[PDB]
């Protein structure tokens, strides 16, 4: 099974706006480039987010990490047994992503996924944020989460759980209109309450948002003010019902894709109990 | 196996007396209604205790929780293999109990049991006690315990352990008369020393009492005074020999059914050793 | 100023009943005799309570401790300056009380007080309780407290505070009848919330009770059952409003003198704020 | 496998001397009798050591505890499979030992062993030591250890490990004469570094000693002085090389059987590494 | 699988220089001799490093520890199944190495390995360093690590992982020349991040260095000055990218073999993720 | 007032025996010489104990430390005001003792005292014990204590308290014969329960013993065995009634002067209460 979400690549219409957004607003460290992709760091990894030019204005790929070469081969076996098509990343791709091995596939609705092992770390170039942020919570919990839009949640659930080994944490009926809600399914693959959530939202993007977790409440408060100065805030500060992350949401430069910046959630383990919630926020998160 | 006791439903002759008892005396939060049942909360769950009108003046059903849908299906398999009749709760029942799935059955002596997963939580409506109580100990240990009256303890033991997966903690020979005792069997299914105890008592009720565990010793002391003002106390403060819960007992409005309100027990795990005790109280619990 | 209450001597009509009471019920260690006084230990001190025959059936003297010889001389100076009569204990008295020096005086209403330093300790004869009690809280807080009955609380307050150096913690209006209360004044001289309380009670004794503090809640619970078996309980378990001691009261063999046996209070310091309370118990302590 | 050593029974020529020894010297609580056996407590168990009259002046039986009835049946299966004779204790024996079930057998060299479950606990009669000892370390580690004398250590090892499930901790070559040593094998069955040790000593007793572990270093120091006053000391204070228990040894009233009274060892788990030691004491334990 | 590295034996041209180096510079305790080998201690073990005369000026053997006799037999089975030649150490060898059993074999490139159990400990002769060092970190992590030079890292990896049970922690591309690096593979067999590393270095020695871990940063700082006074320093203080050990390197008296003396690394477990690093030092370690 | 005891100088008939005793038995570090005095270290100070040849076979001087130059001048003022003769140590003496300033005087019975400030520390030559001892407890508590023999304890008390600023901790009536005891007075000048004790013993030495405090109980146990091998033990292990130091006593090479080697006492402060004890040992310390 997948151990954690390790990296995200975006294909965007405004690379300079994304550069400013990720550095001056979010606080990530600029880390050069690989091919036509600008790279950004959040920790010791050589990169965590890549931004390349493209008309998609969307998530172009997600990197799903396993712990060693044998684990990668076991994932290849799982894909074969499930009848899921995949190819082995060639040397050029391995060098581009800075990994020792990877499998390239797509989820049932077209999102490219890369299962990899052996990422590059550069502790001799210690992390230096571009904006005041004390650090990010990554480690065994990976880079953060994203909310994946899908046309058929049952079909998506079968793939992410049965093939990739994610596990359902809980469900929230997210209120859309007066008498309409969407049942969002929150999945874990480590202690992070959710790494991927699935929801049948009526938006034209592969994801609704990606989320980064900062070390302190002040990191979140300060980031809110930076994103507010940029005119990007989409939610007030709030705390989620299911994972108790205290966060806010803001627009990225790609229309309809947001970022969530948060702190302080609960973590999970083998004893997590599936439950259902009728709201996304225990408090706050008013849309603005 | 069952993971924890999640909810209790009572059918009672005096619904207003039970309402006052559960709120002003015990401290639970009134939480509206579902059908003809008044609902009461002790924590983040949408409800923990339900009270409906009925001549039984007794426990009408107990909700036994599992962690996910697959676990529920495994319980259905266990029931099938054991030859225990059950039905799947329909949509109306699921909506009434606020659960994602449930199996309806009875124990060997007629107590309706509901095995369920995916209960509703409402963190956006934070718990507010109706009387001064700092909170209840629930979580992975479930709502509390009850002592089930049975005509044949061996038969009841076989069902609760072999079919439902409870595990014997210990036995107390409860003194009844001069030369008479009843061997009460205390069973766990999580860290709570007992979730269900079985005893062959000569009372005309399905249960002897249900128990709630408060967060502090003062919660217990204050509750004693409230129940004393109500004229309901049946035991002085005391501490049990087996789980070291410090509690008192009081009458509910249903004759012969008591409530226990306690604090501070030991918890159990895979290393618990079966032992036998000759008294229910290490100290206190004098009957009044 | 007085540093702590160190010892108590009783003159009683039934020495054997007091012996049984202090050992088998309370748990103190029998420690031989000095003259016609039977001695009892609670800790490393050679003795803490003395019981001698006498018709008083009351507290015969209280030992008030200071830390060294110079402190004793300063107390002699305070007594002289205040015009309070005193004598210096002679060699025989010093040997009887096992102290290096002492001043003998009375409070304004006739209770003999002994101010002393240099008590005997016998760590080579480690404490061994006579009943199941894990130990007592003594140390810098002294042996416990007593509630002193006085005809004029203002006069008593002036003596205990201005002459002896006690400090007011708080006041409780203790309900006596329908429209009658007595303002009990609780005084400290160390971290123990009260060492002496003063009250104008209509009883024919020098004290209402003396109190010992045990190390654990179970010590208190077990002691309650022992005193109940002896037919001596006068209050149910409860917790005080002012010091948050969790205790019960019981009769000693001397009519109208009780003992309090408790656990777990708050302690005080230079920042304690005088406040007023309308009840002695936050919960419990129902009289029986 | 055996979970812990639970009880010991001795058959002795001088029952009064053993009574005084176990109470006034060691500190155990006298706990009545069962049949012709005097009982002694160290904790919440109804009894831990039994003393009956007999010419053996030796260990008459050892009680080996398992956690439940099913575990006892699994032990019966192991005995059957190994060809080890055993009988099931009858009702009279169960009542005598205060257990819910037991198997009676002998080790290869004649020591009666009793494998049992469901011992009696009496928390309503809290432990009260007969001499100043703060308490004993028992719990999941059982009552202590004994060193079993055997004529063939390999044969004894095969039985205790393969049949009963004990596990070798380490070996000490115990110096006997100038060029002679005995390889003592120390076995665990829980966190206690050793519960049984095997050694081919030239003594005419079934055991060399039994050992009790007290809670504090002072407990050990005080006990040394009591046993010295009794003229029973056989070793000065010392600390063992293998388990780092700080203890002393003394004679029991049965010739050639000693007691060890100790504190503060290391505990073990699945990661313990077998090692060999050339001395029993890292320091101390000089024979006197 | 191998549990830890337990001992190292060197065959050297200058035994007195090695003696001075290990004692006065490194701080090990001289511990007599066994045959023609001088022995040195770092802890409770009778010996950890042996130095014998020989023209090799290299590591002569490495002792790989398992926890018990059965584990040794399982290793013999693994060797047999893998077609790896081995012999059982005879009594003379067992006595020389002070072990209860051992298997003698070589790795694929000629380094003698000894798999053993039951080493001698001498707690009655407590460790006394020869130079100011507070102690070494050994225990379950073994004596330290060594970096093994091999002509074919893949072949060496297959042996150390598949046969001996070591597990890959991570890889560092160690820069050699302008456009040349060697991929060093770091292997664990316990919590120590690496016990053996494999690298295809162009040196004529079996190992590049061995490493000892001291308890404090000051131990490392003081040792640096001692080795500097001896003219042996080869690296400044630094900290590694992969295990975060803070250390320095120095020459041993055998040309081309160094010692590493360090403190304060991260430890590993089943959750360690394979990663790749482009530098050996996060900071420092400049070669001098 | 004096802040702590900093150093001791002995004048002895057998300098080599004292050298072996202090290093191989006690564990102190040899630290060269100053004039005709051999120096020994216990910590970062350039020296703590000096040994010079002399027929006295006794303590030749004691160094009493203050914190700065102004404090030394205040001590000179106290001496002047008390009429106590003193001289200022000259440059040669300052260089010999490695201090920035000192006053030379004697106590009322002839013991030379040196009050000093600004001692030399040599952290670049870290402490290295000569025998297995983990370290000594010194710091603000100074080097240890000594018991000073005096012909008139009242006179000695007046000097040590009124002139030097020591403070009485407690008194022990030390049993000498059948109906004879000596009241030993234990004095502190920092958190060490006693730095100097005064007693009217009938011995022909200035002191009865000096004491060093080691960091661990094992340090004490191991030291006992070393001193026993040397034939010097004078007491078994024991623990004191007043300071709860766990120690043993042994003979130094100077007849009638002993050393005490201990661990783990209580410390004192402004709240210490004077008490009296009838024994020196709570347990142990049997004379041998
Ligand atoms: O991390 C999260 C936890 C709970 C809910 C959301 C969410 C809210 C609105 C739309 C989509 C998801 C979320 O992001
Ligand atoms: O929680 C508990 C623990 C031990 C005994 C009882 C009990 C006492 C009297 C009657 C029935 C049960 C209990 O409720
Ligand atoms: O310790 C105490 C704290 C508060 C009240 C009392 C008290 C109650 C009734 C009568 C007298 C005193 C007391 O004893
Ligand atoms: O607990 C123990 C640990 C180590 C050795 C012994 C021992 C010593 C002498 C004779 C027999 C055993 C022991 O009792
Ligand atoms: O412990 C270690 C951790 C990381 C790298 C090295 C290393 C550096 C240079 C040459 C060989 C190995 C090392 O020793
Ligand atoms: O540190 C100490 C504490 C208490 C007593 C002594 C003592 C015992 C015998 C003779 C002199 C002193 C001592 O040294
Ligand atoms: Fe989110
Ligand atoms: Fe109950
Ligand atoms: Fe009171
Ligand atoms: Fe033993
Ligand atoms: Fe290294
Ligand atoms: Fe001393």
Swiss-Prot record, chains A, B, C, D, E, F:
The keyword Repressor does not apply. Its cofactor is Fe(2+). Fe cation binds at residues 145, 209, 260. The keyword Repeat applies. GO terms for molecular function: biphenyl-2,3-diol 1,2-dioxygenase activity; ferrous iron binding. Belongs to the extradiol ring-cleavage dioxygenase family. Homooctamer. This is Biphenyl-2,3-diol 1,2-dioxygenase. The lineage of its organism: Bacteria, Pseudomonadati, Pseudomonadota. The gene is bphC.
């Amino acid at each position: 099974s997948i151990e954690r979400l390790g990296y995200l690549g975006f294909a965007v219409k405004d690379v300079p706006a994304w550069d400013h957004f990720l550095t001056k607003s979010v606080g990530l460290m600029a880390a050069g480039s690989a091919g036509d992709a600008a790279l950004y760091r959040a920790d010791q990894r050589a990169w965590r987010i890549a931004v390349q030019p493209g008309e998609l204005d969307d998530l172009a790929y997600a990197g799903l990490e396993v712990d060693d070469a044998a684990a990668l081969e076991r994932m290849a076996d799982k894909l074969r047994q499930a009848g899921v098509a995949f190819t082995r990343g060639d040397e050029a791709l391995m060098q581009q992503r800075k990994v020792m091995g990877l499998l390239c596939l797509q989820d049932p609705f077209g999102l490219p996924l890369e299962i990899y092992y052996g990422p590059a770390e550069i502790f001799h170039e210690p992390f230096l944020p571009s904006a005041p942020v004390s650090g990010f919570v990554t480690g065994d919990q990976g880079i953060g989460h994203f909310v994946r839009c899908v046309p058929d949640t049952a079909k998506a659930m079968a793939f992410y759980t049965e093939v990739l080994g994610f596990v359902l944490s809980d469900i929230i009926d997210i209120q859309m209109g007066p008498e309409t809600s969407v049942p969002a399914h929150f999945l874990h693959c480590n202690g992070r309450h959710h790494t991927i959530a699935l929801a049948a939202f009526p938006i034209p993007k592969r994801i609704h948002h990606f989320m980064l977790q900062a070390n302190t409440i002040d990191d979140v408060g300060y980031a809110f003010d930076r994103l507010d100065a940029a005119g990007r805030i989409t939610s007030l500060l709030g705390r989620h019902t299911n994972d108790q992350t205290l966060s806010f949401y803001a627009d990225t430069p790609s229309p309809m894709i947001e970022v969530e910046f948060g702190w302080g959630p609960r973590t999970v383990d083998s004893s997590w109990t599936v439950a259902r919630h009728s709201r996304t926020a225990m408090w706050g998160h008013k849309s603005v």
